Design a protein around this ligand. Structure first.
Ligand SMILES: CCCCCCCCCCCCCCCCCC(=O)OC[C@H](COP(=O)([O-])OCC(O)COP(=O)([O-])OC[C@@H](COC(=O)CCCCCCCCCCCCCCCCC)OC(=O)CCCCCCCCCCCCCCCCC)OC(=O)CCCCCCCCCCCCCCCCC
Ligand SMILES: CCCCCCCCCCCCCCCCCC(=O)OC[C@H](COP(=O)([O-])OCC[N+](C)(C)C)OC(=O)CCCCCCCCCCCCCCCCC
Ligand SMILES: CCCCCCCCCCCCCCCCCCCC(=O)O[C@H](COC(=O)CCCCCCCCCCCCCC)COP(=O)(O)OCCN
Ligand code: HEM
Ligand code: HEM
Ligand SMILES: CCCCCCCCCCCCCC(=O)OC[C@H](COP(=O)([O-])O)OC(=O)CCCCCCCCCCCCC
Ligand SMILES: CCCCCCCCCCCCO[C@@H]1O[C@H](CO)[C@@H](O[C@H]2O[C@H](CO)[C@@H](O)[C@H](O)[C@H]2O)[C@H](O)[C@H]1O
Lengths: 383, 75, 438, 85, 54, 124
């Protein structure tokens, strides 16, 4: 027996990256998995390097980031790489979740990797939010203020919990130092969950774009998907290069280059672009607590896709009505994103509410209805 | 003479029926008490828990009404 | 509606009990004795079984050969068995051959030779039986199960007795045993099938009238057992099938919980992959085991004695890597007798038992065994009407209450024989006797 | 649900003969021009509606919303703004 | 004594409830008892013992 | 959802003259636009099979049907990876789109649903 199969440790590697049997028809949307792993590795490498130059104390934090930009050799690159890869991480994670929703990767037998994935998504959001605060510019501080005060909505204990998170009476030095420690840690927790959802997936193997079994026709992960993954790695690095080297601040907020000032509140406080859809959902509900619950529910509702999709067919490749509904859902998610960054003014107030209703009604009404109807149309249609 | 066996199907859902669940109702009660006792115990230190819950308990409640003398409190 | 079981006594105190069936042409008469291995001490353990081999080795009148011929000439046969608490000697014959059979039985019990030459001859036959029971796995498992459950107590002893006693049993000890134990107040002459009761009572007055009465006549089925949670593992990797029994201390014949225990046993039930219908049985455990091929078979049992019992299950499996699952699921099904059983399971099992207790009584030997067993354990035959009322009195609440006192979190006796590498240690088995979720 | 090489969990296969040639024997870019033009046009044409419909609708909605918003915060839109608040 | 087992130990829900309630009682009483013990062995040494002068 | 549910609901529709008059033409166009026939699949090839019930139904297929199903899946997987469509005889014609699997799964499910019902019976 060959070594890679004999030796317990090598065999674990082998089982995941080399002999792993994959469907032979995975399309390029199966490549986001590896890009997300690449983002995770870039973030770890750049993040650990930034940690060697950054000072978490609020009197020095912003200046330490300027010191990285100006004084540390290639500091500019490491900082921009870290900040831009945070954006690319979300593009790829949304792409990956989009792939999973369209192709019914959440259905049995892959509910577990899907459900662990929803947790990974929450951890990514928390990681990225804390990292943003560490710059301690104006958006850093004011973002932390707004977002941590959402916990004030928890009845009875809310206020006490916020002061406990802050380590004080407002966002300040204690908060920044604790966010540093947690921002360092959270990516390791995230990597563990990423690995767990893979281990969970390995029982069923990858889905494929037809939604039929691949047990009939498998391909080794290497060399075929190894070399196919290189294409998107180089495509990603080209996009990375254009941002990092030529437009490093396109995805950022200028206000974060002003030092945090607890007195002056910035003209518009928006979160980073990738949180904007959830921000729009929060604004849609007028109640404080309602808004928080809605915002959280917008993520946790993903957990019910296994239930509300009633289809006898996995994924949308063959379901014209489901494909149209999916298209509208995705465009609505982008509209929510846009409404997250407009001013709270007419007519965007009402529009935001309608988009929020559409977001939830996809899971609760339309997908269950449409999937039931398409079941019937396939049966009657093929009689 | 009996022509057919005499039975009905009780309503069920995900393999649970009301006769079975009703036997477990008390047990959820006790676990809820255990969770209540446990939760309250974990936050007994939280000042709000003492102020709003624990100090209002008859007899026992004076255990949680404790003042630092003004002379010994720097803040 | 079955014909009435008639019961008469003699002067000495021998009970005669009969159930006539004028639809059959054959009759089973015999003597049920409220005595067995349990009545021996440690020095004469094996005596009762020894005697059973010598009862047929000739009497004062007929030699061994004459005896053989006399029974051959009857047309039917004689049969005997000794258990822990009961000894039976019966004769199946034709209708009109019953006077011959009662005469032969009376002869072999009262007037047996027990000649030193025959003691010495059987001493080798019985020694060879020690090395051939080894094959009857069910009995090996249950004999070890009694041995461990009732460790160093009379019920824990084997029926055959140790090798050492077989070599030292004398005609004196044999004589003393049957003189002390086979007394009229401990015996029941039973007839089933084509027998007249009044004819049978006359035959008893003719043959069993000069039986000794005991000094202190206690009623029939009168008894201190202290169950030991324990295990015996007899691992044998060369065996293809594992046999496992698990038991808790069960109920005596006269327990108030006797029927409740039967209902509980019926909820778990039996299973056998060789029987066609078994994959469709209602029992939860049956479903789990059949879907997962965890076992070849299982058999719930509730063995009763005068003052104790064992209640448990006997499992056989070739699936040697999943014995852990089989045992896990079995004991979790027992947990549900304490936590979950509702009128659904209880009413289903009562329906199954209301018939089951009557269906067992097929031919004359089963009827005779039923009359004999009930008379020597309860002192009366319980009519089907009484049995139907006692079963109807078992509620779901009673089953739960019984299980919570008898099974839940209780010590088990556990015997595994064969390729039982996969059977976990005692603690992990015993830990399945409760549910942490409840 | 999935095994491993040698016991993958396919239903039994029989009667399919598979043929292929070495990567060194094949032109990797054979018929690339035809594919890049005709095949991509076919695949794009068949999916175009599922993209165009939602994109066009949400872009129209956004355009109407952004134009109204812009107009409400002009002088001309003073009255309509006052009513909207 | 059967009754005690049956009520507080037989159901694990009950046993865990009992353990946590006992932990609550223990925690509160042990705190008070150590406070008093510590004050007796360190008598006249602590601030609370000299505070009265000021 | 269960195949049983889909089949029962479809039978309710096909019974009602009104309903069938409006649904049958819609369902036929749906299936034409679905386009699974363009990869040489039969409708039943698409049904999710990673459930114990469906694994049982597939095991109950006659050998011939089973071998041909495997071929259609392999063939379709190859069309998918090549980004080609079936041509000629590989396209499933409407007359070849037979419900080869529906009877087997309906029987598997019928027994599993009977089993669930009977596990909940109450002696009256
Ligand atoms: C971020 C980091 C950068 C890294 C790049 C990763 C992106 C790669 C990826 O997943 O998308 C490429 C991806 C190519 O993937 P593929 O393996 O050729 O086909 C996947 C689909 O099955 C392709 O679907 P198809 O076979 O039905 O072909 C459809 C496609 C034509 O697809 C192409 O070949 C392009 O055309 C369109 O749908 C365009 C919409 C028409 C509007 C005008 O392009 C698209 O599918 C675009 C359509 C998405 C909407
Ligand atoms: C913008 C709107 C997108 C709508 C997609 C409709 C399908 C389509 O035309 O796509 C092409 C293809 C169609 O591929 P297909 O696999 O259905 O069809 C291949 C060809 N046939 C049918 C012959 C087998 O779809 C994809 O590849 C969809 C991937 C979805 C990724 C979405 C990311 C959005 C992030 C939001 C997260 C929350
Ligand atoms: C970034 C840089 C790209 C990787 C550089 C690898 C060198 C490329 C040339 C070497 C080459 O083709 O040889 C193979 C090495 O590739 C390999 O062994 C690796 C194949 C591709 C590596 C990338 C795998 C997925 C990429 C996505 C990242 C994953 C996410 C984690 C961050 C041997 O292999 P052969 O079998 O072709 O040899 C055939 C005979 N021996
Ligand atoms: C750090 C973030 C993540 C990484 C690095 C990651 C990585 C991967 C990889 C490598 C695979 C296998 C190949 C592939 O299908 O692309 C995969 C599959 C999967 N991931 Fe993720 N993932 C991440 C986040 C998520 C999230 C947030 C979800 C869900 C909300 C998710 C759900 C899944 C599912 C369901 C599959 C199985 C899909 C299939 O192959 O059909 N993952 N992931
Ligand atoms: C999933 C992994 C990670 C994500 C998504 C992430 C995201 C971010 C984000 C969004 C920022 C704000 C960037 C800016 O505008 O300047 C940031 C800053 C930072 N991150 Fe991370 N990060 C990750 C991992 C790490 C790790 C592992 C470290 C190790 C310490 C780290 C250290 C830092 C430091 C020191 C800063 C502050 C300096 C700066 O703003 O560039 N990050 N991170
Ligand atoms: C503090 C720690 C909390 C631990 C809580 C454990 C609660 C679990 C209770 C439980 O298992 O109920 C089972 C019952 C149905 O019974 P069955 O079908 O398992 O027989 O289920 C239903 O009745 C529903
Ligand atoms: C992704 C980065 C590379 C490192 C590997 C990822 C770390 C996770 C590995 C530990 C998780 C356990 O991983 C588990 O291991 C065993 C053997 O290694 C695999 O077992 C599989 O492969 C081996 C041979 O290759 C067979 O004996 C077995 O029949 C098959 O199921 C499991 O399918 C996989 O789920």
């Amino acid at each position: 027996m060959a070594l890679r199969k004999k030796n317990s440790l090598l065999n674990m590697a082998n089982s995941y990256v080399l002999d792993s049997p994959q469907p032979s028809n995975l399309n390029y949307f199966w490549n986001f998995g590896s890009l997300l792993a690449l983002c995770l590795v870039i973030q770890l490498a750049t993040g650990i390097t930034l940690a060697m130059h950054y000072t978490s104390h609020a009197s020095l934090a912003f200046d330490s980031v300027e010191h990285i930009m100006r004084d540390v050799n290639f500091g500019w690159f490491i900082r921009y790489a870290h900040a831009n890869t945070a954006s690319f991480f979300f593009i790829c994670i949304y792409a990956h979740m989009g792939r999973n929703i369209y192709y019914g990767s959440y259905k049995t037998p892959r509910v577990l990797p899907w459900s662990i994935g929803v947790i990974i998504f929450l951890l990514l959001i928390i990681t990225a939010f804390m990292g943003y605060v560490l710059v301690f510019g104006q958006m850093s501080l004011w973002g932390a203020t707004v977002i941590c005060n959402l916990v004030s909505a928890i009845p009875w204990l809310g206020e006490d919990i916020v002061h406990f998170l802050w380590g004080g009476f407002s966002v300040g030095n204690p908060t920044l130092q604790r966010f540093f420690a947690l921002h360092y840690l959270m990516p390791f927790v995230l990597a563990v969950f990423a690995l767990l959802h893979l281990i969970a997936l390995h029982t069923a193997g990858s889905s494929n774009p037809l939604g039929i079994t691949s047990n009939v026709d498998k391909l080794s992960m290497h060399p075929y998907y190894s070399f196919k993954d290189l294409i998107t790695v180089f495509a990603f690095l080209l996009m990375f290069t254009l941002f990092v080297f030529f437009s490093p601040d396109k995805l950022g907020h200028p206000d974060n280059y002003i030092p945090a000032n607890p007195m002056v509140t910035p003209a518009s406080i928006v979160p980073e672009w990738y949180l904007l859809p959830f921000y729009a959902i929060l604004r849609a509900i007028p109640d404080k607590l309602g808004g928080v619950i809605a915002m959280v529910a917008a993520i946790l509702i993903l957990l019910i896709l296994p239930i509300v999709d009633r289809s006898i067919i996995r994924g949308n490749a063959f379901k014209p009505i489901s494909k149209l509904l999916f298209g509208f859902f995705i465009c609505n998610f982008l509209l929510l994103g846009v409404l997250g960054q407009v001013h709270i003014e007419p007519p965007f107030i009402v529009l935001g509410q309608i988009c929020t209703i559409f977001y939830f009604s996809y899971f609760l009404i339309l997908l269950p209805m449409v999937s039931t109807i398409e079941n019937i149309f396939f049966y009657i249609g093929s009689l | 003479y009996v022509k057919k066996p005499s039975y009905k199907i009780v309503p069920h859902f995900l393999g649970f029926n009301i006769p079975t669940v009703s036997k477990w109702i008390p047990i959820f009660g006790i676990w809820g008490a255990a969770a209540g006792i446990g939760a309250l115990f974990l936050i007994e230190g939280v000042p709000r828990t003492r102020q709003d819950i624990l100090s209002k308990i008859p007899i026992i409640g004076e255990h949680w009404i404790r003042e630092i003398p003004a002379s010994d409190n720097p803040f | 509606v079955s014909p009435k079981t008639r019961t008469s006594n003699l002067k000495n105190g021998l009970t005669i009990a009969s159930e006539s069936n004028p639809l059959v042409q054959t009759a089973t008469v015999g003597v049920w004795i409220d005595a067995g291995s349990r009545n021996e001490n440690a020095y004469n353990n094996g005596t009762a079984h020894f005697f059973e081999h010598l009862a047929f080795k000739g009497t004062d009148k007929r030699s061994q050969h004459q005896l053989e011929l006399d029974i051959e000439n009857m047309g039917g046969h004689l049969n005997a068995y000794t258990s822990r608490e009961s000894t039976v000697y019966y004769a199946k014959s034709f209708k009109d051959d019953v006077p011959k059979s009662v005469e032969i039985l009376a002869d072999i019990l009262q007037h047996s030779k027990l000649a030193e030459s025959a003691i010495d001859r059987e001493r080798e036959v019985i020694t060879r039986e020690l090395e051939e029971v080894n094959k009857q796995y069910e009995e090996v498992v249950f004999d070890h199960l009694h041995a461990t459950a009732f460790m160093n107590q009379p019920l824990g002893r084997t029926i055959l007795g140790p090798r050492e006693n077989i070599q030292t049993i004398t005609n004196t000890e044999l004589r003393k045993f049957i003189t002390e134990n086979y007394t009229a107040d401990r015996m029941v002459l039973v007839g089933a099938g084509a027998v007249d009761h009044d004819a049978l009572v006359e035959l008893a007055e003719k043959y069993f009238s000069h039986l000794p009465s005991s000094q202190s006549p206690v009623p029939l089925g009168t008894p201190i057992p202290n169950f030991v949670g324990s295990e015996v593992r007899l691992r044998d990797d060369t065996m293809p099938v594992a046999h496992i029994a698990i038991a808790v201390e069960g109920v005596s014949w006269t327990s108030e919980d006797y029927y409740t225990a039967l209902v509980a046993q019926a909820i778990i039930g039996n299973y056998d992959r060789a029987v066609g219908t078994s994959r469709h049985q209602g029992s939860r455990l049956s479903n789990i085991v059949s879907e997962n091929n965890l076992a070849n078979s299982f058999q719930s049992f509730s063995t009763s004695y005068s003052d104790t019992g064992l209640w448990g299950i006997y499992l056989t499996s070739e699936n040697t890597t999943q014995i852990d699952d089989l045992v896990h699921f079995t004991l979790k099904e027992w947990n549900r007798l304490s936590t979950s059983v509702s009128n659904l399971q209880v009413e289903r099992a009562k329906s199954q038992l209301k018939a089951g207790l009557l269906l067992s009584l097929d031919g004359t030997t089963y009827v005779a065994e039923d009359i004999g067993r009930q008379l020597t354990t309860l002192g009366r035959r319980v009519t089907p009407a009484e049995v139907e009322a006692k079963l109807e009195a078992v509620t779901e609440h009673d089953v739960r209450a019984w299980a919570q006192k008898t099974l839940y979190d209780k010590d088990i006796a556990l015997v595994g024989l064969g390729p039982i590498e996969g059977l976990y240690d005692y603690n992990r088995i015993r830990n399945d006797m409760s549910m942490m979720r409840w | 649900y999935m095994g491993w090489w040698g016991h993958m969990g396919s239903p039994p296969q029989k009667g399919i003969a598979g043929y292929t040639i070495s990567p060194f024997a094949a032109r990797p870019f054979a018929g690339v021009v035809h594919a890049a033009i005709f095949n991509t046009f076919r695949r794009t044409k068949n999916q175009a509606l599922f993209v165009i419909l939602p994109v066009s609708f949400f872009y129209y909605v956004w355009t109407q919303a952004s134009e109204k918003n812009e107009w409400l915060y002009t002088k001309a839109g003073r009255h309509e703004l006052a009513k909207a608040l | 004594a059967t009754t005690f087992y049956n009520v507080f130990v037989k159901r694990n829900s009950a046993f865990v409830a009992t353990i946590l309630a006992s932990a609550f009682v223990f925690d509160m009483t042990f705190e008070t008892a150590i406070d008093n013990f510590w004050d007796r062995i360190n008598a006249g040494k602590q601030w609370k013992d000299i505070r009265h002068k000021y | 959802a269960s195949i049983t549910s889909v089949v029962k609901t479809s039978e309710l529709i096909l019974k009602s003259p009104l309903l069938s008059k409006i649904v049958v033409p819609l369902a036929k166009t749906y299936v034409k636009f679905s386009g699974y026939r363009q990869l040489g699949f039969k409708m039943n090839d698409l049904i999710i099979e990673e459930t114990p019930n469906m694994q049982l139904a597939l095991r109950r297929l006659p050998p011939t049907e089973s071998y041909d199903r495997v071929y259609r899946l392999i063939r379709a997987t190859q069309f998918s990876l090549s980004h080609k469509l079936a041509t000629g005889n590989d396209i499933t014609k409407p007359e070849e789109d037979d419900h080869y699997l529906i009877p087997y799964i309906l029987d598997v499910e019928a027994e599993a649903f009977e089993k669930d019902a009977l596990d909940n019976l109450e002696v009256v």
